[PDB]
Amino acid sequence: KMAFTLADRVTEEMLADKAALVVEVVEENYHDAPIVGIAVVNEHGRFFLRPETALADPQFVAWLGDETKKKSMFDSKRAAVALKWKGIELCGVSFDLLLAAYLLDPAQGVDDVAAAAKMKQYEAVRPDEAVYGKGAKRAVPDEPVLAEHLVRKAAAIWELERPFLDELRRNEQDRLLVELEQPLSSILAEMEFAGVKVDTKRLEQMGKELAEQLGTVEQRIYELAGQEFNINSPKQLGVILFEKLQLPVLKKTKTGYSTSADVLEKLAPYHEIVENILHYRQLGKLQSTYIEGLLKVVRPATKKVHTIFNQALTQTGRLSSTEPNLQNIPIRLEEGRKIRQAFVPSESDWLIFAADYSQIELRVLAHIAEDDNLMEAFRRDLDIHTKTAMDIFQVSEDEVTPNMRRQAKAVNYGIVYGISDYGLAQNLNISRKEAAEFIERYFESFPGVKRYMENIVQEAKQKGYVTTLLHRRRYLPDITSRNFNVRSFAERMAMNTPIQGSAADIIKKAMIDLNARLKEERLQAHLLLQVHDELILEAPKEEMERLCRLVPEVMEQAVTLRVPLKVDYHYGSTWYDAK
DNA sequence: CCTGACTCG
DNA sequence: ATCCGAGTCAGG
Ligand SMILES: Nc1nc2c(ncn2[C@H]2CC[C@@H](COP(=O)(O)OP(=O)(O)OP(=O)(O)O)O2)c(=O)[nH]1
Ligand SMILES: [Mg+2]
């Protein structure tokens, strides 16, 4: 049905200046993964190329790297990074169908071309899973079957571009695609390929010392319990706590007794064993995930880890980070924080530089809600996380520890994003009446925030979606639901999404601005990671002074709000020391 | 394979 | 019933 040339060699007509390009990587983690086939669709026709042929062809490599030869693709970051591992530069990506679909509707969870095509009732292409299979059965099919699939995906991209661009334009999201998400994709590609260097000697020694400590804590828990059991089994643990030891049952889930951290903390007045168990479960996660799990994914020759930043996953416009997740490295407890000493610069005499937006969603909220009490607190450079702390612990602005401030930060965001008196009461282990009284006084200090949250909920019910500063959108069909729980969740998404998503928009723009700046000043410094409202770079020790001005500046100037954006920063010999 | 742990923003 | 957004892991 669909005619294409199964080419044995690259020809001139394949190198047109506009094309849909497919560079197929079957493995989910595309780092150093095989490219199994290439397809090109342009004005002159449809072509399948063998990677061995095409990627060793100097005209084709030239064309890939030519920014004036425009390519339309699906998930160009995947292709760009796979090509980098093949030592080939990909330039000229002008349209990314994945990112287009994601902006039109993040809820569709589009993750292959077929799923994007479905959005415009385009059905002349198969889902990847149907072609490659799943799990132990996953495999590249016979060449003619593979070639047709890749060509059909290219043909789909070729035909779907205008219809997607048109709809994006109708939604005012065209610039969000072309000026924000697509340039960010190339930047993330650079960051993933660069990777972050790991001190495996240090990590392995931490691991050995952690194993000894675990055994010690383990034995202590068995002594306290009067029995050996699997502490890492909530089921077995529940039997020990609520049957053998007869501690009060505070919560159940569908599977049985809850042994959540919140529940165990509340049981501390009944038996000291619950504090030891909380400690054990923390240490065990450090070992399984941040020592063993991390060492498993280190590339042994370079000692680097290469995360994948999923740019088309979260419902709010944030990135996520996978395999490994480098956006959830411990920091809150010193015991875990020490893992960060194993993340080091990739060159000698280089340093890690970390910058963090201050009270970021509180600033964005002030701007969007136009709450005058709040817009003012930032014009007076107040720290609302700390003030809240002083209040909930009756402790004053000098005595507030980082930990207390951390807790207050969850209270602040909790309240603005719709926590109930019950939730705040369970969170601070205080009485519900007191919690309710606190929420009351909070919205008295910031009446505009309260008005904004009431108004954005009604607007969501009327329109069926909410939007961010740069026109990112989330649909919320459930919000007019007759069901209280379903409706309630949707209402709180209406309160939170515009704010968290606007904050995502901002740091994304900041990353693009920051890179352009690094280049024009010919600095060696480059981004390693983004952590939602943090940017982490590495650079020669001599560029620290310049970065101390460049980075906070670019991040603060990414957008202009009705309040000051404020960025905190540090650098040091390891990520840990960048404090 | 999911659930409930722990981790982060 | 009860702030929001994420990922990985051991146990089952
Ligand atoms: N709904 C919600 N969002 C949170 C919570 N913690 C963090 N976030 C979101 C909101 C802020 C954003 C950044 O995290 P941070 O810890 O840096 O919070 P921050 O407000 O910027 O504080 P800081 O001034 O210390 O940098 O991520 C939380 O407990 N609930
Ligand atoms: Mg911050």
XYZ file of C-alpha atoms (C1' of nucleotides) and ligand atoms in Angstrom:
631
model
C 0.000 0.000 0.000
C 2.554 2.583 1.124
C 5.382 2.749 -1.395
C 8.926 3.268 -0.171
C 12.421 2.501 -1.421
C 14.414 0.010 0.614
C 17.665 1.697 -0.324
C 21.105 0.086 -0.358
C 22.896 3.445 -0.509
C 22.304 7.124 0.307
C 21.195 9.170 -2.710
C 20.807 12.881 -3.358
C 17.019 12.942 -3.159
C 17.200 11.630 0.416
C 19.079 14.772 1.456
C 16.360 17.344 0.731
C 16.113 20.385 2.980
C 12.887 19.304 4.640
C 12.210 15.773 5.784
C 10.519 13.633 8.380
C 13.322 11.614 9.920
C 13.141 8.427 11.971
C 16.276 7.189 13.733
C 14.963 4.129 15.499
C 16.136 3.081 18.941
C 14.097 0.173 20.309
C 15.530 0.023 23.834
C 13.727 2.204 26.351
C 17.021 3.568 27.699
C 18.565 4.997 24.577
C 22.039 5.629 26.034
C 24.583 3.769 23.896
C 21.686 1.829 22.392
C 21.649 0.293 18.875
C 20.137 2.293 16.052
C 18.228 -0.429 14.226
C 16.969 1.466 11.198
C 16.501 4.873 9.618
C 13.609 6.246 7.566
C 13.337 9.449 5.551
C 10.206 10.911 4.002
C 10.492 14.092 1.982
C 9.083 15.655 -1.197
C 10.936 13.138 -3.380
C 9.543 10.003 -1.758
C 9.982 7.532 1.093
C 13.212 5.775 2.072
C 14.453 3.147 4.518
C 18.206 3.083 5.191
C 20.383 0.612 7.060
C 22.248 2.314 9.901
C 25.568 0.589 9.053
C 25.243 2.099 5.579
C 23.755 5.483 6.323
C 25.702 6.424 9.441
C 29.064 5.673 7.782
C 28.090 7.741 4.737
C 29.762 11.115 4.866
C 26.986 12.863 2.927
C 24.350 11.488 5.307
C 26.357 12.380 8.401
C 26.849 15.805 6.839
C 23.099 16.159 6.213
C 22.218 15.074 9.756
C 24.480 17.754 11.164
C 23.356 20.523 8.807
C 21.094 22.937 10.702
C 19.628 24.241 7.436
C 18.350 20.798 6.532
C 15.181 20.734 8.611
C 13.913 17.526 10.215
C 10.529 16.677 11.662
C 10.741 13.838 14.162
C 9.093 12.143 17.135
C 11.209 12.301 20.336
C 14.219 14.019 18.728
C 16.109 13.959 22.051
C 16.135 10.142 21.916
C 17.497 10.289 18.371
C 19.950 13.085 19.133
C 21.386 11.252 22.124
C 21.572 7.865 20.361
C 23.405 9.583 17.523
C 25.840 11.251 19.966
C 26.758 7.791 21.267
C 27.419 6.938 17.613
C 29.652 9.999 17.399
C 27.249 11.830 15.063
C 25.795 15.344 15.512
C 22.089 15.861 14.763
C 21.045 19.428 13.974
C 18.091 21.083 12.281
C 15.217 19.510 14.218
C 12.324 21.870 13.470
C 9.377 19.836 14.713
C 8.989 17.218 17.420
C 5.658 15.348 17.297
C 6.116 13.967 20.824
C 6.475 17.422 22.337
C 3.610 18.728 20.176
C 1.260 15.996 21.414
C 2.417 16.535 25.009
C 1.555 20.231 24.895
C -1.849 19.661 23.277
C -2.781 17.223 26.008
C -0.390 15.787 28.583
C -3.069 13.412 29.900
C -3.015 11.291 26.743
C 0.407 10.029 27.848
C 1.490 9.894 24.213
C 4.707 7.883 23.981
C 4.727 6.581 20.424
C 3.868 7.857 16.965
C 0.733 5.700 16.729
C -0.631 7.318 19.907
C 0.044 10.798 18.521
C -1.571 9.859 15.195
C -4.706 8.752 17.051
C -5.213 12.380 18.124
C -5.978 13.358 14.528
C -7.589 10.034 13.612
C -4.528 8.983 11.632
C -4.379 5.188 11.612
C -1.939 4.194 8.856
C 0.782 3.377 11.416
C 1.170 0.702 14.114
C 2.038 1.134 17.807
C 5.658 0.314 18.570
C 4.714 -2.421 21.048
C 2.676 -4.250 18.408
C 5.717 -4.300 16.135
C 8.488 -5.073 18.651
C 6.619 -7.044 21.321
C 7.075 -6.818 25.086
C 9.413 -8.104 27.786
C 11.384 -11.229 26.992
C 9.660 -11.303 23.595
C 10.854 -7.862 22.454
C 12.803 -8.017 19.196
C 13.484 -6.221 15.935
C 11.295 -7.820 13.234
C 12.371 -9.034 9.790
C 13.856 -6.153 7.766
C 10.846 -5.661 5.470
C 8.502 -5.504 8.476
C 10.857 -3.144 10.292
C 11.311 -0.942 7.227
C 7.598 -0.547 6.606
C 7.009 0.413 10.247
C 9.744 3.072 10.257
C 8.567 4.464 6.927
C 4.949 4.571 8.208
C 6.069 6.463 11.296
C 7.966 8.965 9.101
C 4.952 9.314 6.795
C 2.776 9.914 9.839
C 5.136 12.628 11.127
C 5.293 14.089 7.634
C 1.499 14.337 7.367
C 0.718 15.168 10.987
C 3.011 18.179 11.383
C 0.736 20.805 9.869
C -2.389 19.560 11.681
C -0.560 19.584 15.030
C 1.066 22.945 14.438
C -2.349 24.311 13.450
C -3.987 23.097 16.658
C -1.088 24.378 18.756
C -1.443 27.734 17.077
C -5.183 27.708 17.838
C -4.294 27.105 21.510
C -1.517 29.737 21.560
C 1.036 26.996 22.251
C 2.986 27.214 19.008
C 5.745 29.356 20.506
C 5.711 27.171 23.614
C 6.707 24.324 21.278
C 9.116 26.102 18.952
C 10.762 28.544 21.365
C 10.644 26.646 24.671
C 10.225 22.857 24.572
C 12.126 22.174 21.343
C 15.248 24.192 22.207
C 15.130 22.678 25.705
C 15.135 19.198 24.154
C 18.597 19.822 22.609
C 19.886 21.182 25.906
C 18.653 18.112 27.816
C 20.272 15.927 25.146
C 23.630 17.593 25.896
C 23.132 17.162 29.637
C 22.205 13.478 29.415
C 25.134 12.671 27.106
C 27.629 14.555 29.284
C 26.521 12.646 32.359
C 27.714 13.108 35.925
C 30.911 11.539 37.223
C 30.766 9.261 40.246
C 33.385 8.532 42.883
C 32.868 4.779 42.987
C 35.681 4.247 45.458
C 33.855 6.490 47.932
C 30.421 5.143 47.125
C 31.621 1.580 47.557
C 33.220 2.393 50.928
C 30.025 4.130 52.080
C 28.223 0.965 51.014
C 30.416 -1.291 53.094
C 30.033 0.945 56.169
C 26.296 1.151 55.597
C 26.001 -2.654 55.444
C 27.630 -2.919 58.887
C 25.373 -0.280 60.380
C 22.278 -1.968 58.935
C 23.189 -5.259 60.586
C 23.575 -3.446 63.893
C 20.205 -1.700 63.620
C 18.600 -4.897 62.376
C 19.723 -6.878 65.418
C 18.576 -4.111 67.750
C 15.096 -4.200 66.223
C 14.911 -8.000 66.589
C 15.885 -7.618 70.246
C 13.218 -4.974 70.806
C 10.616 -7.074 68.964
C 11.598 -10.295 70.702
C 11.638 -11.963 67.287
C 13.376 -11.953 63.910
C 11.192 -10.853 60.995
C 11.539 -9.081 57.671
C 11.539 -5.398 58.591
C 11.190 -4.547 54.908
C 7.888 -6.352 54.698
C 5.054 -4.032 55.781
C 2.918 -7.172 56.133
C 5.303 -8.913 58.535
C 5.994 -5.616 60.262
C 2.273 -5.035 60.809
C 1.938 -8.376 62.519
C 4.814 -7.460 64.866
C 3.548 -3.979 65.733
C -0.199 -4.499 65.857
C -0.532 -8.124 66.853
C 2.548 -9.173 68.850
C 3.267 -5.764 70.436
C -0.419 -4.740 70.434
C 0.221 -1.139 69.480
C -2.791 0.985 68.469
C -3.929 0.673 64.868
C -4.068 4.238 63.537
C -4.660 3.543 59.841
C -5.389 0.654 57.499
C -5.148 0.360 53.753
C -6.801 -2.136 51.453
C -3.968 -4.618 52.093
C -3.890 -4.368 55.911
C -2.373 -2.389 58.764
C -0.555 0.755 57.726
C 3.113 1.004 58.685
C 3.696 4.362 57.011
C 6.367 6.708 58.372
C 3.597 9.049 59.600
C 1.925 6.247 61.531
C 5.146 4.922 63.031
C 6.146 8.419 64.187
C 2.807 8.761 66.002
C 3.371 5.429 67.764
C 6.658 6.575 69.329
C 5.038 7.155 72.750
C 4.055 3.455 72.857
C 7.253 1.640 71.926
C 10.784 2.756 71.067
C 10.974 0.102 68.351
C 9.154 2.280 65.839
C 11.967 4.865 65.766
C 14.550 2.132 65.119
C 12.407 0.701 62.307
C 12.061 4.116 60.671
C 15.854 4.387 60.871
C 16.305 0.904 59.415
C 14.012 1.598 56.461
C 15.879 4.852 55.682
C 19.262 3.120 55.733
C 17.947 0.213 53.644
C 16.755 2.599 50.913
C 20.122 4.373 50.952
C 21.808 1.032 50.380
C 19.409 -0.458 47.821
C 18.889 2.639 45.734
C 21.657 5.196 46.199
C 24.550 2.787 46.727
C 23.706 -0.479 44.941
C 21.181 0.905 42.462
C 23.472 3.769 41.558
C 26.628 1.616 41.139
C 24.649 -0.705 38.825
C 24.116 2.104 36.293
C 27.580 3.694 36.427
C 29.403 3.256 33.140
C 32.588 1.613 34.410
C 35.086 3.082 31.909
C 34.175 6.734 32.538
C 32.506 6.297 35.946
C 29.635 8.416 34.658
C 25.874 8.034 35.128
C 23.583 9.214 32.327
C 20.026 9.930 33.373
C 17.160 10.402 30.957
C 15.076 13.535 31.548
C 11.540 12.706 30.468
C 10.264 15.953 29.007
C 6.864 14.585 27.980
C 5.537 12.873 31.082
C 4.406 15.085 33.948
C 0.935 16.573 33.977
C 2.220 20.008 35.006
C 5.146 20.614 32.660
C 7.900 19.508 35.000
C 10.604 17.124 33.794
C 11.160 13.803 35.448
C 14.432 11.857 35.679
C 14.877 8.107 35.232
C 17.458 5.321 35.267
C 18.773 6.647 37.489
C 16.609 9.350 38.972
C 19.070 12.112 39.773
C 16.317 14.454 40.955
C 15.772 12.565 44.194
C 19.265 12.215 45.643
C 19.148 12.478 49.469
C 19.693 15.808 51.175
C 17.219 16.111 54.072
C 19.085 13.872 56.560
C 22.857 14.159 57.000
C 23.125 10.351 56.887
C 21.723 10.325 53.337
C 23.071 13.702 52.314
C 26.557 12.174 52.337
C 25.718 10.263 49.151
C 26.208 13.584 47.369
C 29.958 13.385 48.115
C 30.150 10.674 45.466
C 28.982 13.013 42.692
C 32.101 14.802 41.474
C 33.314 16.965 38.550
C 34.221 15.147 35.320
C 37.620 16.847 35.038
C 40.342 17.596 37.581
C 40.361 21.149 38.970
C 36.682 21.488 38.119
C 33.921 22.178 40.647
C 30.188 21.589 41.046
C 28.004 24.732 41.030
C 24.389 24.557 42.267
C 21.706 27.282 42.082
C 18.264 27.081 43.759
C 15.260 29.409 43.212
C 14.045 30.839 46.541
C 10.447 30.215 47.692
C 9.738 29.740 44.050
C 6.068 28.745 43.825
C 5.176 31.270 46.551
C 6.601 34.008 44.283
C 4.823 32.704 41.208
C 1.606 32.491 43.258
C 1.970 36.074 44.462
C 2.318 37.193 40.843
C -0.597 35.155 39.518
C -2.986 35.646 42.436
C -1.825 39.262 42.690
C -2.114 38.953 46.461
C -0.802 42.263 47.787
C 0.256 41.045 51.236
C 2.308 38.339 49.527
C 3.622 40.390 46.607
C 4.843 42.719 49.353
C 6.585 40.140 51.536
C 8.879 39.401 48.591
C 9.443 43.071 47.849
C 10.613 43.203 51.469
C 12.743 40.092 50.884
C 10.969 38.167 53.640
C 11.387 34.424 54.104
C 7.841 33.147 54.444
C 9.043 29.575 55.085
C 10.943 30.829 58.158
C 8.199 33.156 59.417
C 5.716 30.293 59.228
C 8.239 28.178 61.154
C 8.567 30.729 63.960
C 4.797 30.565 64.286
C 4.025 26.837 64.280
C 6.782 26.093 66.793
C 6.601 29.383 68.721
C 10.357 29.736 68.402
C 11.423 33.088 66.877
C 13.442 34.008 63.787
C 16.822 33.068 65.252
C 16.061 29.591 66.586
C 14.526 28.180 63.391
C 16.634 25.256 62.153
C 16.777 24.122 58.499
C 14.644 21.127 59.520
C 11.924 23.272 61.107
C 12.011 25.586 58.099
C 11.669 22.511 55.894
C 8.545 21.475 57.804
C 7.140 25.006 57.579
C 7.723 24.915 53.808
C 5.355 21.931 53.563
C 2.862 23.781 55.712
C 2.992 26.829 53.453
C 2.547 24.920 50.223
C 0.115 22.561 51.902
C -2.161 25.413 52.888
C -2.134 27.299 49.569
C -2.758 24.022 47.714
C -5.791 23.088 49.780
C -4.734 20.959 52.762
C -7.587 20.338 55.200
C -7.559 20.841 58.932
C -7.282 17.054 59.214
C -4.212 16.949 56.987
C -2.439 19.803 58.696
C -3.344 18.281 62.080
C -1.897 14.894 61.106
C 1.087 16.652 59.539
C 2.093 18.666 62.623
C 0.624 16.064 64.994
C -1.480 18.874 66.467
C -5.203 19.144 67.227
C -7.604 19.610 64.300
C -9.031 22.721 65.946
C -5.579 24.288 66.123
C -4.841 23.311 62.523
C -8.115 24.836 61.355
C -7.324 27.986 63.294
C -3.984 28.183 61.527
C -5.387 27.817 58.019
C -7.891 30.520 58.945
C -5.180 32.988 60.005
C -3.037 32.153 56.967
C -5.752 33.127 54.498
C -6.344 36.238 56.596
C -2.748 37.253 55.929
C -3.151 36.466 52.233
C -6.807 37.058 51.265
C -5.892 37.452 47.584
C -4.496 33.939 47.434
C -7.781 32.669 48.852
C -9.743 34.614 46.224
C -7.468 33.362 43.457
C -7.954 29.740 44.516
C -11.739 30.097 44.640
C -11.752 31.835 41.253
C -9.402 29.411 39.446
C -11.541 26.470 40.563
C -14.695 28.061 39.116
C -12.837 28.971 35.903
C -11.641 25.362 35.594
C -15.246 24.112 35.914
C -16.348 26.561 33.200
C -13.515 25.944 30.672
C -12.520 22.391 31.468
C -8.787 23.166 31.670
C -6.267 25.456 33.348
C -3.176 27.133 31.900
C 0.254 28.470 32.891
C 2.156 31.700 32.284
C 3.570 30.416 28.970
C 0.266 28.833 27.890
C 0.865 25.259 28.963
C -2.496 23.582 29.532
C -3.973 20.770 31.649
C -7.502 19.479 31.046
C -9.581 18.592 34.096
C -12.731 16.781 32.880
C -13.369 15.335 36.354
C -13.818 18.759 37.906
C -17.591 18.963 37.292
C -18.042 15.409 38.570
C -20.970 14.605 40.836
C -18.590 12.393 42.868
C -17.137 14.334 45.803
C -13.750 12.649 45.916
C -13.148 12.683 42.165
C -14.320 16.288 41.953
C -12.258 17.326 44.952
C -8.996 15.962 43.542
C -9.659 17.802 40.315
C -10.304 21.064 42.172
C -6.970 20.858 43.965
C -5.221 20.197 40.618
C -6.833 23.423 39.492
C -5.240 25.168 42.491
C -1.793 23.633 42.056
C -1.141 23.019 38.350
C -1.060 26.641 37.128
C 1.494 27.463 39.848
C 3.776 24.433 39.698
C 3.511 24.478 35.886
C 4.337 28.174 35.658
C 7.381 27.486 37.788
C 8.342 24.716 35.348
C 7.936 27.153 32.440
C 10.294 29.603 34.159
C 13.218 27.295 34.854
C 12.895 25.830 31.362
C 13.247 29.327 29.913
C 16.141 29.972 32.302
C 17.992 26.906 31.011
C 17.741 28.122 27.414
C 18.877 31.648 28.316
C 21.723 30.306 30.460
C 23.156 28.145 27.675
C 23.062 30.925 25.070
C 24.994 32.997 27.630
C 27.603 30.308 28.319
C 28.293 29.975 24.586
C 28.644 33.649 23.713
C 31.081 34.049 26.622
C 32.908 30.868 25.549
C 32.863 29.351 29.044
C 33.587 25.644 29.506
C 30.898 25.442 32.188
C 27.915 23.312 31.228
C 24.697 22.079 32.782
C 24.650 18.628 34.387
C 21.221 18.510 35.991
C 17.908 20.219 36.559
C 16.065 19.447 39.800
C 12.741 21.248 39.317
C 13.847 24.600 40.670
C 17.584 23.940 40.759
C 20.256 23.972 38.071
C 23.478 22.066 38.650
C 26.556 22.784 36.541
C 30.217 21.823 36.550
C 33.027 24.127 35.405
C 36.739 24.880 35.707
C 37.549 26.293 39.154
C 38.533 29.553 37.430
C 34.999 30.194 36.137
C 33.367 30.132 39.581
C 33.483 33.905 40.080
C 31.873 34.531 36.687
C 29.226 31.845 37.269
C 28.368 33.411 40.633
C 27.116 36.393 38.624
C 25.973 34.731 35.412
C 23.831 31.891 36.764
C 21.786 33.640 39.456
C 21.313 36.536 37.030
C 20.012 34.538 34.069
C 17.756 32.450 36.323
C 16.353 35.554 38.008
C 15.784 37.328 34.670
C 14.229 34.369 32.853
C 10.818 36.014 33.252
C 9.697 39.340 34.677
C 7.039 39.058 37.366
C 5.363 41.444 39.829
C 7.794 40.161 42.450
C 11.574 39.601 42.538
C 12.874 36.177 41.573
C 15.664 35.285 43.993
C 18.294 32.557 43.506
C 20.604 30.988 46.108
C 23.870 29.392 44.986
C 26.943 27.486 46.140
C 29.882 25.571 44.670
C 32.384 23.016 45.929
C 34.482 19.954 45.178
C 31.501 17.599 45.198
C 27.750 18.006 44.924
C 27.610 17.604 48.712
C 29.998 20.525 49.172
C 27.972 22.727 46.839
C 26.131 24.179 49.833
C 3.318 -8.079 38.100
C 1.306 -4.273 42.200
C 1.791 -2.081 46.922
C 3.697 0.358 50.208
C 7.935 1.758 51.562
C 11.751 5.668 51.057
C 13.644 9.521 48.181
C 13.293 14.424 46.010
C 11.034 19.101 44.307
C -12.055 12.144 52.495
C -8.724 15.306 53.558
C -1.804 19.882 49.729
C 0.621 18.847 44.477
C 4.249 16.709 41.145
C 7.634 12.811 40.477
C 10.944 7.376 40.578
C 12.923 3.055 42.535
C 13.051 -0.749 45.330
C 12.062 -5.236 48.214
C 8.489 -8.166 49.202
C 4.825 -10.677 47.876
N 2.550 21.094 46.836
C 3.936 21.040 47.341
N 4.928 21.489 46.591
C 6.198 21.435 47.062
C 6.468 20.877 48.319
N 7.820 20.960 48.496
C 8.350 21.537 47.385
N 7.357 21.803 46.496
C 7.407 22.469 45.256
C 7.034 23.883 45.547
C 8.307 24.604 45.565
C 9.176 23.854 44.605
C 10.595 23.896 45.026
O 10.999 23.192 46.151
P 11.894 23.900 47.222
O 12.220 22.934 48.323
O 13.129 24.510 46.622
O 10.892 24.959 47.834
P 11.149 26.554 47.807
O 9.772 27.075 48.144
O 11.628 27.040 46.514
O 12.101 26.792 49.068
P 13.594 27.368 49.112
O 13.521 28.851 49.349
O 14.225 26.696 50.276
O 14.389 27.110 47.885
O 8.705 22.524 44.618
C 5.374 20.402 49.063
O 5.505 19.849 50.308
N 4.136 20.490 48.546
Mg 13.743 26.500 45.926
